[PDB]
Amino acid sequence: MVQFLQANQESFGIMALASAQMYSSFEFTCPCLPDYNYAYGIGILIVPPIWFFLLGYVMNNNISVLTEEWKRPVGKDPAVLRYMFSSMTQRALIAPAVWIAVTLMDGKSFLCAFSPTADLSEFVNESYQSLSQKELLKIQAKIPCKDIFEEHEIISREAATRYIRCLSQACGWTFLMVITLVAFLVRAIRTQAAFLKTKYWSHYIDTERKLFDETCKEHAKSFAKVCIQQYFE
Amino acid sequence: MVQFLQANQESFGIMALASAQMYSSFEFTCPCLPDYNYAYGIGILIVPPIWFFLLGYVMNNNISVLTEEWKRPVGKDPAVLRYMFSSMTQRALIAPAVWIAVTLMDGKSFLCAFSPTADLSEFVNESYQSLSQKELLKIQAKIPCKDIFEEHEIISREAATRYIRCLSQACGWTFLMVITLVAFLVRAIRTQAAFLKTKYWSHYIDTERKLFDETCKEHAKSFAKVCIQQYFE
Amino acid sequence: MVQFLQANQESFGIMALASAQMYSSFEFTCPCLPDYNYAYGIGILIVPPIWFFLLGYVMNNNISVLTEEWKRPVGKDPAVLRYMFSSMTQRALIAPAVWIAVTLMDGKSFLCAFSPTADLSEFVNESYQSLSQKELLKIQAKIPCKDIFEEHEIISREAATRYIRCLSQACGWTFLMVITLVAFLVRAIRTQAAFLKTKYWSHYIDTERKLFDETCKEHAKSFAKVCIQQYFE
Amino acid sequence: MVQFLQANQESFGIMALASAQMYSSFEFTCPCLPDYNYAYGIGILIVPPIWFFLLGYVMNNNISVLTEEWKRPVGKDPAVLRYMFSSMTQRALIAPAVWIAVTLMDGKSFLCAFSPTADLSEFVNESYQSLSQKELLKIQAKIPCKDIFEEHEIISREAATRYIRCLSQACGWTFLMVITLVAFLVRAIRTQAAFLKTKYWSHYIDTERKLFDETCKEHAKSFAKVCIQQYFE
Amino acid sequence: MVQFLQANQESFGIMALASAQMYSSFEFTCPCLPDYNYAYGIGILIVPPIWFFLLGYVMNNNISVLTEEWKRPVGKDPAVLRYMFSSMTQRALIAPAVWIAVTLMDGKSFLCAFSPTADLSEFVNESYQSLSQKELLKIQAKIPCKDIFEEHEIISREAATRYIRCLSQACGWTFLMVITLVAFLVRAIRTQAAFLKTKYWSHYIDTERKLFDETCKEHAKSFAKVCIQQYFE
Amino acid sequence: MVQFLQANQESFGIMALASAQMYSSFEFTCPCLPDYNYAYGIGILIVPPIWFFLLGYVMNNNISVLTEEWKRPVGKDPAVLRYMFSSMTQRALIAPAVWIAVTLMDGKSFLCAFSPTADLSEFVNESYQSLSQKELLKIQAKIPCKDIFEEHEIISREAATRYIRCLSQACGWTFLMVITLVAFLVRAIRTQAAFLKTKYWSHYIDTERKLFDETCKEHAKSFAKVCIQQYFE
Amino acid sequence: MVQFLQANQESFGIMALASAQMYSSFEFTCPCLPDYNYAYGIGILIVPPIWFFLLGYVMNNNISVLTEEWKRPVGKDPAVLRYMFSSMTQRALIAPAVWIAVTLMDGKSFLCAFSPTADLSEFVNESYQSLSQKELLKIQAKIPCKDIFEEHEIISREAATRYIRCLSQACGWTFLMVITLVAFLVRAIRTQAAFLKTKYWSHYIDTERKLFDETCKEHAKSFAKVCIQQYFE
């Protein structure tokens, strides 16, 4: 909370804090069922970033012109469309990456998902060191559920929890490193004139809108003054 | 809380935070009665978005002109009325969608509603695996009520709670995805001149109001100066 | 708390947050007596909105002119008085409505009031299913008092509490819907020239006050400069 | 706390929040002694508003001129003194009223004061329904002291607490209503030229101070420039 | 905390909130020893206000000129020195008064100090109603120490605590009233020309500093422009 | 939290608060396994600063020109590249240093890492003063895990925790001192003309961008005005 | 926390709040070992102020010129170097003093340090009034460690804690008084022309930097306009 606010202050690239806060304000609840744990985990991992990607796409006020150009046979930039589309895509990819990083550093989804299948043989008590893995499926399935796990005589819930959480944090750090390296290479490589042409078209849109609102003002002023004569009368 | 404030800061499309905060500051209380659970759940789900829709309609300062035009036989735009009405409607639909999304991601209403009817056969203890569903109605009815559920010997309250809550979260995510796709398609499709005409009428209203207040100022200045002569005397 | 602050930020129609915060910062205490519960409940429900109505009336800086006009036989607007008075009244009605809505959504007053009389026959234990209603008066009277209700062997306090609270929330939602519909109809119906005339009189008041303060400034400047001569001496 | 800050934001008539916050940040401690309870209660009720009244008097920057005029036999306004003095008094009365309202709505002082004398015959256990009122004095005296009241076998502390607190809240609401009605009548009745004369004298003071500081500036500039010649040397 | 921030907002006379916050953020620890309780109490009461007085003296940026004038045999105001010195002193006295008021309203220091000596004969159990006062010294000495007082069989710690705390609050209120009355009389009595002369000297200092910085600017501009010629080269 | 916000306010050199807050908002979880404790500790110590270094590199908007110059055989500054590259590097080194300092002052990583190997012979109970170090490996491995350490009969967890934490704090203070001394020497030694040349190139970039956007504006204005003629038609 | 923020608001001399907040956000951990307690205490007392002193030295943007002048045989002020160096030193001394004051008023370091050596003969139980001081070393060593001190049958931890904490607070108050007196004397004594000369050199630096950036702007504008011709082409 305090951190997201601080990030916002620094900013004062905004959907990042939106995703972070939405994750922190989300009631994560592992169903703790052997048939659905994997589904729920991978779902929390995969669906929200997809939705964030779409949301980033729609909130961009120039998708309309992209569709317009992709529609015509030959429209009134042979390639700036590529450039502006790729810039929009790059802008959009921030929130899903942030969501994945956050949900991995906090090993909740990983714990929910890989709890039933993973091998925890050093954690299972030595007494029940020999029993059908189908029962261990049901048992380990309840591991991320504090109020439900009632087999302290068999498995230490806390040890396994810390184990899988460390695994998740390691994966999250590797993911962050890979993303940072890719971003570094991209900025170190990248296409010049298209940027100037899009700057031109942007300034064109701005001056068109401002001229239009000004001429609307001045042309409505005449009508206003004509009709306000009776208003005094 | 911290999240809503952050969203407001980002904004600095406002009723969204209003709806979110109103939900968070709402004492949700499932009656935990077999005759009314469904009613209360679906009510909390359906009524508040309807009220929010109406509220969005009334708070818009141009509904009056819409009624005026819909009233006359032929008024002084043959179709911009369609356009401005649809834009108002689109502006209004935000808050109900936000309310539904929030109340689904937090599986409270879903839990209250579908608790008595849904089949929880893996959760009911094996001892009472055979008993009239009418008794299970009363029993499962109390599931969302922590302080009231006194049948731990029959059903695990926590397991069923997590189950139905995961179901609710899944439904909420699907709803969010569908809404986002629909919004994407709408922005990718959509009617051009009507926008310019409404821009014209807006500028007309603005210049009319400003000219009126200025002429009121200048015409009252004469009276003020005439009457202030005795004020010095 | 966080919500009221957010509402204030959105605003930046102010007494609404005042009423909400005053309710949240109010020590509601049901006397839990069969003779006074009804009185206290309906009082908390009815008196504060009346006081808020009066407060809204007095804080409006143009009530004086309303009294002045209502006093004279024929004063220097034959009907704008109706208009400005009704606008003041409409401005004033916000806070009482907000108070009623808030105190109904939180079923405290309803619980305190209708606890002794209402019939709770499914909640009373089956053992004491037959006993004089006068004793049940005293017993149910203590229901909203956690620290005082000492008859768990007779009535479940929590079940009845949730029941009556759901009733209160339903009533509050119906009230909100009715108020919203009425507001929608009012804005959809409503008297034109009176608005312009009141705008004129307002601008007149403004220019009169500004001209008066300016002439006071300039006429006191002479005296100031005359007397400051000795100040240097 | 959150409420006082919100009130301050609305304001952005300031001593009101000062009094409210000072009450909230005050360690109220009922001595729980039959000889002093009444004294302490009425003291907390009466002394702080008197001090607030005095504080409002002194903080007003024009009390000096009031004393100056009340001192002379005939000073250089035959009656604006009445007007400005009454306006200062009205400004001052806010904080004491706020303090009384707050301390009554929270029935602490009332409870401390009227605990030993008031008749609580329905609350005293039936076993000790007959015993000298002098002992009940000592006993009921300890009622507002949670950690000290050790006679649960005789009197329910919570029931009596709620009772007297409801009484206090009722008295506070009546007080608020009376004050609001009086304010409404005052604004509906009230003396015109004195206001303009005080506006004149205020503008006179302002222009005198500004002319004085400006002439000080310009007359010191000469000296500054004369002495800065050696400063370069 | 919330109150100090509100006071700061109102202000936006600053050391007052500094003293208040420093008191609230101070680990008050009564040594609970018969030989040192009095010392510690009176010390916390007396030393911090003295230090605050000194701090107010030093932070004032015109003490230097006061020393300069008090040093010379006859300096370049025969009495404004009295005036500015007294105004500085008055400005300085705020923080010590605030500290004393705060530390008295919260009867901690009073409790620590007057615990061993004061007579608590109604609080001491009747069994030990006769024992050497030297033992009662040690016992009552531990009264302000919750974790240390182990004589519940002899003295009620809470009753005596409330007693002495009420005494402290009474003393604090009397102190506040006396200070307010003195301030009222001072403002109602008070020396005119000295104020204008100090206003003159202040404006002189301001214009001297501004002229000096401006002439430094302009005279360094020449050097800057002369040396920047090679900078381009 | 409160501290990071205060630092941000002081700033209003920003990644420092980012790193601090990210550490505070990080679920540190020592796997408490003899095979992985060292790995996890040193990883939390080493990886995040590396990632922060990379992040500082990429976020700098002039890495592109550095790559461009390092790419060409001879580009259009023979050495300012060294200067700007070193300044970027210096700017980048802040966040890793801050992270290391923070994670050392809070002896979590140190405790997790050096728990299994370090010799705690004064802390191990005297009964088990003679047992294979391989068992002590497993035992001491669980020391940073409160919920897991179940050998209070062998080792005091708290004593060893405080011991290793003091060691970590000492190391952190030495690190801070060394870094501060190095920074002092660097600022006391350091290359002059390169700074002016980079200032020149920066101003060049600024004026180029501003001239380009202005000429885009003016050249699009013609098109806008040409096409807005039909817009009125 | 709230206090530091308030201080920052008052300020809006900044490292003071930095030091205060850093102390409050520091995990103080007394090793509770007879061999190291003294070391840790005096270290926390002495090292951080030294580091703060160095930090204040380096953060000052004019240390470079001080080194430059101290380096040359005879540089281009025969004594303003003394003046600016002393002013920098005075600016730097704030944070260490603040740190010492804070860490003394909260008697943590004092308690950790002087616990093993100090004589607590009135606190040690009378049974063990005769035993080798070497054992009391180990015992009293654990006094500042709540979770570790297991000799309630020998020494009251709380009494000794309060004792040593009062000692620390007394020392802190004396330190504050001495520092305030020294500051008062310094301001009352203090070297005039050097201040004006440093003001001159500061204004010189400012105008040089501004002239340089302006000439860079204007000289790069020509190149920008020359190269933007092809940009339109």
Ligand SMILES: *[C@@H]1O[C@H](CO)[C@@H](O)[C@H](O)[C@H]1NC(C)=O
């Ligand atoms: C293993 O199980 C036995 C009994 O089955 C129990 O006594 C023992 O404490 C268990 N050990 C662990 C580590 O769970």
Ligand SMILES: *[C@@H]1O[C@H](CO)[C@@H](O)[C@H](O)[C@H]1NC(C)=O
């Ligand atoms: C099922 O019921 C039996 C007795 O009816 C009880 O002993 C057992 O613990 C119950 N099991 C569960 C899972 O509720």
Ligand SMILES: *[C@@H]1O[C@H](CO)[C@@H](O)[C@H](O)[C@H]1NC(C)=O
């Ligand atoms: C009803 O009362 C009987 C005894 O009077 C008690 O044993 C039983 O638990 C009670 N049931 C409820 C639901 O209160």
Ligand SMILES: *[C@@H]1O[C@H](CO)[C@@H](O)[C@H](O)[C@H]1NC(C)=O
């Ligand atoms: C009244 O006193 C009797 C014994 O004196 C006790 O058993 C009973 O519970 C008391 N009742 C109340 C309501 O205090």
Ligand SMILES: *[C@@H]1O[C@H](CO)[C@@H](O)[C@H](O)[C@H]1NC(C)=O
């Ligand atoms: C007084 O002391 C006796 C025994 O010495 C004890 O039983 C009694 O409760 C005490 N009373 C009080 C009020 O402390």
Ligand SMILES: *[C@@H]1O[C@H](CO)[C@@H](O)[C@H](O)[C@H]1NC(C)=O
């Ligand atoms: C050491 O172990 C013995 C038994 O093995 C136990 O009684 C004693 O309390 C232990 N001492 C410590 C300091 O752990």
Ligand SMILES: *[C@@H]1O[C@H](CO)[C@@H](O)[C@H](O)[C@H]1NC(C)=O
């Ligand atoms: C002193 O020690 C004895 C036994 O050694 C114990 O009974 C007594 O309570 C102790 N007193 C204190 C004040 O620790």
